């Protein structure tokens, strides 16, 4: 007779529906749990959502932290081969991760942040050049996983750029931190794929 | 130890979800215990889950902005809801002053964006609140041959939320975020309603 439970279906469902490729079963188990809770307690899901939106500051402090942390895996992802193309891949990767990771501490000042975007674009570029320079060291009929990972990276670099544009109208910084983290993860995936096939 | 086993990515389970369940516990232990256990288990198997859930909730903020604004505008239909069907000047006053507060609060979405007319709106809300309160304390002293350990609570409860509304205005001029204002205005409409209910008993 009222719409007190709309947020269960309008927010929490889509939230669980859209996390299904991450972990199908947990999405299922948590939807079920909210539905049960909301059935007993009309209005509860709404209250929970509102308490989450109120911790925005915490959650942005945390996402900043995650992004700063994303800068440094040294032991796992790293190609073994001393070849210049492969070694150049490591250092161009590292430099991109480092620059992306420092976004939280440059974003609040327009000027130094304009320099950072340029540095980033420069780094993404320098990474692509090194990704393309290394293609030749893999049998040309055995590059399917390499070329596909390259596309993924570009897509996420497109997404990141499209995320910048939106930041200059919104002002909503988390979108940047989130997208830059995903980009960091994609350059990690480049390294994994590139080391694995070699 | 526990702090060292648990991934850094699991942090928003403890920084954000646990406080939510701790507050819910006071009002529904079962729901809280159950929702906590589901999060605990899901987080344990897929570290980072809670983080992803929260980010997706934050991304859907506009759905919540729309929903809260909606509830506020729809409250214009229920402005004459909860009138006390007692016919004496104290109660005629308490009905009209409560009706006028609900009417003005539900007008907020229309004024909020034009900041000039919003400053003019703030004064009237405070003026309507004060004129509700001034009417309350009269019916409080006249009709109190019965319940004190409930009516004292409600008068307190109204003041608590009313100054929390006023508080949200200043945070809004600091913020630019309407949802906080819509939310508190909705709450104050509810408190007003609770007042009309408490005096009916």
B15 at interface of A, judged by CB pairs closer than 8 A: yes
Mutation target among B7, B9, B12, B78 for the A interface, most CBs of A within 10 A: B12
Same domain, yes or no, for A40 and A124? no
Same domain, yes or no, for B24 and B113? no
Query: Domain with A8 in it: what CATH number?
Result: 1.10.12.70
| Nearest partner of A55 among B68, B187, B58, judged by Cα | B58
| Nearest partner of B122 among B63, B74, B90, B167, judged by Cα | B167
Same domain, yes or no, for B121 and B180? yes
In angstroms, how far is the first alpha carbon of chain A from the final one? 63
Mutation target among A21, A42, A49 for the B interface, most CBs of B within 10 A: A49
Whether A14 and B60 lie within 8 Å, measured CB to CB: yes
Query: Phi-psi bin for B114: left (phi > 0), alpha (psi -120 to 50), beta?
Result: beta
Give B-chain residues touching A7 at CB under 8 angstroms.
Answer: 63-64, 67
**Nearest by CB: A51 against B20, B42, B55:** B20
d(CA A163, CA A183): 12
Whether B11 and A55 lie within 8 Å, measured CB to CB: no
| Nearest partner of B20 among A16, A34, A65, judged by Cα | A34
Query: Domain with B101 in it: what CATH number?
Result: 1.20.120.330
Q: What are phi and psi of A94, to 5 degrees?
A: -55, -45
Query: In chain B, positions 72-131, which contact chain A (CB-CB < 8 Å)?
Result: none
Same domain, yes or no, for B77 and B118? yes
3 state SS of B47 = coil
Same domain, yes or no, for A60 and A146? yes
Give B-chain residues touching A5 at CB under 8 angstroms.
Answer: none
Same domain, yes or no, for A20 and A94? no
Q: Which domain holds residue A47?
A: 1-54
Residue holding tokens 């304009």? A114
Same domain, yes or no, for B66 and B156? yes
Query: In chain B, positions 129-188, which contact chain A (CB-CB < 8 Å)?
Result: 179, 183
Q: What is the DSSP letter of A8?
A: I
CA angle B73, B79, B85 (to 5 degrees): 165
Same domain, yes or no, for A92 and A164? yes
Same domain, yes or no, for B100 and B141? yes
Q: What is the DSSP letter of A11?
A: I
Element (H, E) at A27: helix A20-40
Same domain, yes or no, for A61 and A147? yes
Which of B22, B44, B59 delimits the end of a domain?
B59
Instruction: Provide the domain count of chain A.
Output: 2
* DSSP codes joined into one string, A49-118: HHHHHTTHHHHHHHHHHHHHHTT---SSS------HHHHHHHHHHHHHHHHHHTGGGTTTSHHHHHHHHH
Which of B59, B78, B94 delimits the end of a domain?
B59
Tokens for A84, please give them.
Answer: 């210049």
Same domain, yes or no, for A41 and A111? no
Same domain, yes or no, for A110 and A193? yes
B33 at interface of A, judged by CB pairs closer than 8 A: no
Which of B59, B89, B108 delimits the end of a domain?
B59
Whether B42 and A29 lie within 8 Å, measured CB to CB: yes
């Amino acid at each position: 007779t009222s719409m007190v439970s709309m947020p269960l279906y309008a927010v929490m469902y889509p939230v669980f529906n859209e996390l299904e490729r991450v972990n199908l079963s947990a999405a299922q188990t948590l939807r079920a749990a909210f539905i049960k809770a909301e059935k007993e307690n009309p209005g509860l899901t709404q209250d929970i959502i509102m308490k989450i939106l109120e911790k925005k500051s915490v959650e942005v402090n945390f996402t900043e932290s995650l992004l700063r942390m994303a800068a440094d895996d040294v032991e796992e992802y790293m190609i073994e081969r001393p070849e210049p193309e492969f070694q150049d891949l490591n250092e161009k990767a590292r430099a991109l991760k480092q620059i992306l990771s420092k976004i939280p501490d440059e974003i609040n000042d327009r000027v130094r942040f304009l320099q950072t975007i340029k540095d980033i674009a420069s780094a993404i570029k320098e990474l692509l050049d090194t990704v393309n320079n290394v293609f030749k060291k893999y049998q040309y009929q055995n590059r399917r996983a390499l070329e596909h990972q390259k596309k993924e990276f570009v897509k996420y670099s497109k997404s990141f750029s499209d995320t910048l544009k939106t930041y200059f109208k919104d002002g909503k910084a988390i979108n940047v931190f989130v997208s830059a983290n995903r980009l960091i993860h994609q350059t990690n995936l480049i390294l994994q794929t590139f080391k694995t096939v070699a």
